[PDB]
Design a protein around this motif. Structure first.
Motif, PDB file in Angstrom:
ATOM      1  N   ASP A   5       0.460   5.181   3.965  1.00 38.82           N
ATOM      2  CA  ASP A   5      -0.701   5.030   3.108  1.00 38.82           C
ATOM      3  C   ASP A   5      -1.623   3.948   3.677  1.00 38.82           C
ATOM      4  O   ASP A   5      -1.215   3.192   4.561  1.00 38.82           O
ATOM      5  CB  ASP A   5      -0.260   4.664   1.691  1.00 38.82           C
ATOM      6  CG  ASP A   5       0.479   5.794   0.999  1.00 38.82           C
ATOM      7  OD1 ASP A   5       0.360   6.953   1.447  1.00 38.82           O
ATOM      8  OD2 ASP A   5       1.181   5.521   0.004  1.00 38.82           O
ATOM      9  N   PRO A   6      -2.873   3.875   3.214  1.00 34.30           N
ATOM     10  CA  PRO A   6      -3.823   2.889   3.770  1.00 34.30           C
ATOM     11  C   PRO A   6      -3.311   1.458   3.706  1.00 34.30           C
ATOM     12  O   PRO A   6      -3.356   0.757   4.728  1.00 34.30           O
ATOM     13  CB  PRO A   6      -5.078   3.079   2.906  1.00 34.30           C
ATOM     14  CG  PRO A   6      -4.997   4.475   2.447  1.00 34.30           C
ATOM     15  CD  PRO A   6      -3.541   4.757   2.238  1.00 34.30           C
ATOM     16  N   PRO A   7      -2.840   0.957   2.551  1.00 34.47           N
ATOM     17  CA  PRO A   7      -2.384  -0.445   2.542  1.00 34.47           C
ATOM     18  C   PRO A   7      -1.193  -0.700   3.449  1.00 34.47           C
ATOM     19  O   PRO A   7      -1.110  -1.777   4.050  1.00 34.47           O
ATOM     20  CB  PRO A   7      -2.040  -0.702   1.069  1.00 34.47           C
ATOM     21  CG  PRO A   7      -1.747   0.610   0.518  1.00 34.47           C
ATOM     22  CD  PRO A   7      -2.656   1.567   1.217  1.00 34.47           C
ATOM     23  N   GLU A   8      -0.272   0.258   3.568  1.00 39.31           N
ATOM     24  CA  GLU A   8       0.847   0.102   4.492  1.00 39.31           C
ATOM     25  C   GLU A   8       0.424   0.362   5.931  1.00 39.31           C
ATOM     26  O   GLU A   8       0.970  -0.241   6.860  1.00 39.31           O
ATOM     27  CB  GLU A   8       1.991   1.039   4.102  1.00 39.31           C
ATOM     28  CG  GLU A   8       3.036   0.399   3.204  1.00 39.31           C
ATOM     29  CD  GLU A   8       2.485   0.022   1.847  1.00 39.31           C
ATOM     30  OE1 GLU A   8       1.871   0.888   1.190  1.00 39.31           O
ATOM     31  OE2 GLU A   8       2.667  -1.143   1.433  1.00 39.31           O
TER      32      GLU A   8
END
Lengths: 49, 49
Positions: A5-8
């Motif tokens: 995902d974007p934050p990860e």
């Protein structure tokens, strides 16, 4: 980008950005030194001509 | 410049979903915080009310 995902994903993308930017800066610095050497050689060749 | 206070009542163990970059049912379909959220999340048990 497909696995995370974007934050990860961002923390991995930041590491890749830092590494590739460092590699590109190193390359450009080496090219600047080589360009100075070639400029000296070209000035010598122009004088010889 | 301004402050926005978002008030809602939530079930207990899913309160952790209220944070930046979280995934989970409330974070997915009910109340998604931005990944760069600047602010405070304040919660307390409300079984009495």
């Amino acid at each position: 980008l497909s696995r995370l995902d974007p934050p990860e994903a961002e923390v991995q993308i930041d590491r890749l950005i830092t590494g590739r930017l460092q590699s590109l800066q190193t390359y450009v610095t080496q090219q600047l030194i080589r360009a100075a050497e070639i400029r000296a050689s070209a000035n010598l060749a122009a004088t010889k001509m | 410049t301004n402050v926005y206070a978002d008030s809602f009542v939530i079930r207990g163990d899913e309160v952790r979903q209220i944070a930046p970059g979280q995934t989970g049912k409330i974070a997915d379909y009910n109340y998604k915080l931005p990944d760069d959220f600047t602010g405070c999340v304040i919660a307390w048990n409300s079984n009495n009310l």
